[PDB]
Fold E3 ubiquitin-protein ligase RNF213.
Amino acid sequence: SNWALDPAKMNRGIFVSRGSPNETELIESAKGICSSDILVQDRVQGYFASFAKAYETVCKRQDKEFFGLRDYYSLIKMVFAAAKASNRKPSPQDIAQAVLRNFSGKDDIQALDIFLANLPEAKCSEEVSPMQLIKQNIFGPQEDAESRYLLVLTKNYVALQILQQTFFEGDQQPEIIFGSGFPKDQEYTQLCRNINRVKICMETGKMVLLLNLQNLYESLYDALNQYYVHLGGQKYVDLGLGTHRVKCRVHPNFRLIVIEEKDVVYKHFPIPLINRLEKHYLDINTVLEKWQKSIVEELCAWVEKFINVKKRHKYSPSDVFIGYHSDACASVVLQVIERQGPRALTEELHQKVSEEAKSILLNCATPDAVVRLSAYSLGGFAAEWLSQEYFHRQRHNSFADFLQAHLHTADLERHAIFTEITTFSRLLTSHDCEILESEVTGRAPKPTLLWLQQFDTEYSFLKEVRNCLTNTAKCKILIFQTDFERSAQLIASAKYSVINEINKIRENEDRIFVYFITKLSRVGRGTAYVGFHGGLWQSVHIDDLRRSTLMVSDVTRLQHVTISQLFA
Amino acid sequence: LATAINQRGIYVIQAPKGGQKISPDTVLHLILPESPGSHEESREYSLEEVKELLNKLMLMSGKKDRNNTEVERFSEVFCSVQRLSQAFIDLHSAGNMLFRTWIAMAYCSPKQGVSLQMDFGLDLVTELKEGGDVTELLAALCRQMEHFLD
Amino acid sequence: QTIHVLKALNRCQLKHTIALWQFLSAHKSEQLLRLHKEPFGEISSRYKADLSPENAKLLSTFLNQTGLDAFLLELHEMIILKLKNPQTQTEERFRPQWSLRDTLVSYMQTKESEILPEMASQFPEEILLASCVSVWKTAAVLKWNREMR
Amino acid sequence: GVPLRKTIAKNLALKENVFMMVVCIELKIPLFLVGKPGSSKSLAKTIVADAMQGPAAYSDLFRSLKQVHLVSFQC
Amino acid sequence: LLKFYELPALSAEIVCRMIRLLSVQTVFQGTLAATKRWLREVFTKNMLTSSGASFTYVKEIEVWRRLVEIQFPAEHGWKESLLGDMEWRLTKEEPLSQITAYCNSCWDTKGLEDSVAKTFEKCIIEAVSSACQSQTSILQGFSYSDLRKFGIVLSAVITKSWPRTADNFNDILKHLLTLADVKHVFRLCGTDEKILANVTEDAKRLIAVADSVLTKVVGDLLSGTILVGQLELIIKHKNQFLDIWQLREKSLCAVEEALDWRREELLLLKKEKRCVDSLLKMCGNVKHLIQVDFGVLAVRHSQDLSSKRLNDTVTVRLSTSSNSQRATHYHLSSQVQEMAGKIDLLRDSHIFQLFWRILELEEVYDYLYQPSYRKFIKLHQDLKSGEVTLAEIDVIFKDF
């Protein structure tokens, strides 16, 4: 136990209580760790004292037990390995990187300041961003210099957008471990299937992302310690589901990432769990530079102007930009910069980023808002530009036109293309899928249309997804439907399941176009829909998905025609 | 064992005998018959035993092999039957009387064309039997039972 | 133009038509209120007066001892039909200064519908027509709270 | 005798925990270990589980001792 | 066609006269709408040419001035809307293209007191603010024909690039040395005085603050009371520093000698500091077995030099004196100086680290350093000669 006990219940057995070690015990532990080599041990010996004084300082400073001995031991291990590989005295940058990786994760603590206070290494102050640390954890540069598993603390589960974009840019994508949002499947059997998937990923070496599944910790408690038994060179770790405990094989390439909200961790997460994992905080603000954040502010202002003006019901951004929320502009900017690449800052890059962001936001706007902006701007240049882009350079007239444009213009490297669509009209029926087939014939097979609510269990959804993915067609179009009445859990779980299954059926270079269509109401029912999930997804609003048999008119034609002329 | 349960296994849902308190354990039990040419005995398993077998399958099946098909089939049927059991329990708690002598047998694989069999123990209602895939029938039956509960 | 309408109207018959109209209009407005949007833009601001603390306590006590749904439907119908039509605005038998109780009791009598006994006795007369719309708003909020509870 | 990983510290905490665990298990004495996270407790548990495979043990010492099968319950 | 711009303007002015003689808002809206429609149809393509050197349409500014100046009543918002459209057309272009067109081209002579001038100035100031935030050189190879507008642009660059804490001496020096635009600013303002006449008073104030800072820095450098942080920052950017001081002083060599001398004295002080560090670290290593008392040395070493004035930390050399010896803040004894020097040479030696068994610093020298160095020399002579014993190779090089 890590918590205290009552002696009377122990039946007068033997009770041993361990106290927090002093500096000498910590330095002896460090020397024990380094004993495997003598040169490196001598080199780091000087640093051991400062590391121990820093650790006791941190432990007395922090309010709640958040850092512990595992962090200190991991620091010593990482410095030992760095020196061993370098064959030279540990450079300041390495000590800084070790300290940041181990003792980061909290705001109220300034670890690096404490550790630098004891040393003259502060001269470096070349700080390393959480993205670099997370990369080094997942892809840390024969030897099992194994780093701890990652815990990413985020806000509004934003972290998932960043990682998918940055590190998993290609199809090396990890597997998402999450709680299902379908009505009849989240119970014990779901934990059983999840831990089965964790085991299979350990055996195969596929990296895993743990979403809000802290309730699975009792199954993983022993693996997180990463104390392994060995057989024939391979390492094994213990896993449990109930009273059954078994040893399972861990592929060296295996890594674990837990994504969780900062407040859940601070309040609810047990302290030994916080100690077992290497902790980092990730939010869009931690990725964006200053000028990118400035672009975010500019886009928020441009939005506010777009809503009202360059009577006057005083619309809000959510009522115009479907799915808008506090972080929409930041997500858009991140997606833009990530697609552009690492190109250096230039006036061209600044302008192009701003314009791309505006275009993406506009793609989710209602035609009604663009018309309002033009009318109330009396035909301003900006209004006509935006109308041109929306009505002519974009494909909001129907779903068939969007699909044709996406099929023709989309990239050829991205075998899996993900799209999110919002609409106010009626969802697609079989007749609409037939029309789409008639348009697509010669390019892809009949689009497969599924309604997420019709599914009561995740397994039936996976079965149909696999039925579709298993066809030999080089191009596949998958369409999922939902009516937003609660629901967001279903959409998220379906999204994750589809991503995982696409990652699994990947040996072929088939090109899969995935569309998620949500039917909303202009007024609503209180709970505001949230889009702009960014990452792999592209958010497009289509007011009406049908091809308008009642009028073949594409708007911006009627804009210069009277009702009298209609009856000519 | 799981392969045999898929091939021969039969799940049974019935009201608690011996005045036992109503719960999933008392309501649901698994029958595993013997196959032709083999002389082992038809065993009866309790819900705890099926959950133990399931845990074993999950921890064993880490082999990146097609074996998941059988585990997946086993798991699917198990979950469906558990869902059906809770629906019965609900009708029991609400005071319904039809589902007081009602016995249902779900055949993990068709026996002479039968996948589900239901008998209410009444002279007016003859035995009900239907074929096909068990999970579709079970989902439809669960949905009807829930609508009937409301 | 009949796809989802048919599923809502599958049970109603012609005799229900008028009541159905009333229900729909009130439900329509209630939605706007839940979203904090103004449902009564077409109503004269003069009829949009506020309620004093004492009249608020009296109204709350009445509503606690009242059938909230019927009261809301009737008061809504009165507001929409009488106070909205500028023709009935110039018809000054619905002046903001007139007591809400007497106006509503008169209206209900004219359509010879069964009148709620609380209307004549329990309804405070100190509440005038100018605050009538605030009354409906306040009543709807209680319903919405009852619906959350 | 037990083949520990090289980066593991043969410190006093793990030494005493392993010794006490071995003695108490072999003699069936109840042992209660209480310490803040990282005090070589679970590491000692895994090490004693691996070492005490009597005939399959790594050293003549543990080969002379008994064979241990652990059942775990997370309270 | 654009050539006919007078006709729309005349019809709009007629509408103005009719309104002033008196559905008004409706007629205004339709008038503004139709005018915008015409401008859109005519001004179809970019505002500026390739380099941002010239205007696509020679008459754009004339049409904007003509149409904006029509004296509609203010309440209706004619001027604001048209100027918003012009601003939109400007902001679409690259900042450097905007500034190039603004300064070089001949659009302004018509009277820069109008609203179009104030709008274009506003846009150019915002562009300069953005570029300063981007720290990209603007004035590099810049050319100009209108000195007044170039002076406005230059003052905007100076004011926007300046640190937010415009009073921080250290951040002023950092800005001056790091930012390249400052070289160009000083070069231009020195070459032809007329530029400064076109420059604002705020920019001249900032220039005067910068000049004062540089003069104080040079006085400290020559005298020797300069902070080690400032001397480090000056040495890291010695080229820009000497360029700027050459320009200013020619407008208004020994500094190279002084800065070289201070680089040498700083290198000496850092060498001594690192020797003391190595000695302290070795004693800290043998801490677990023996305790050492050198309070004064640890205190002196602990002080951060950046805040300290050089002459207090180390002796500085001047032709105001002869080439006398240097002395430092530490005042190490000869024994400790030799010991720290050798320990610095062998601070990476694994064979010297172990190689030895509260004591005072002279006792530390006597007991630890001398036996150790004696044995180390004897080992080096054994290896050079080859007479080393196998037991020595087994014990010492057990690790290698």
Observations:
- Chains D and C do not touch (no CB pair under 8 Å).
- The radius of gyration of chain D is 12 Å.
- Strands of chain D lie at 31-34.
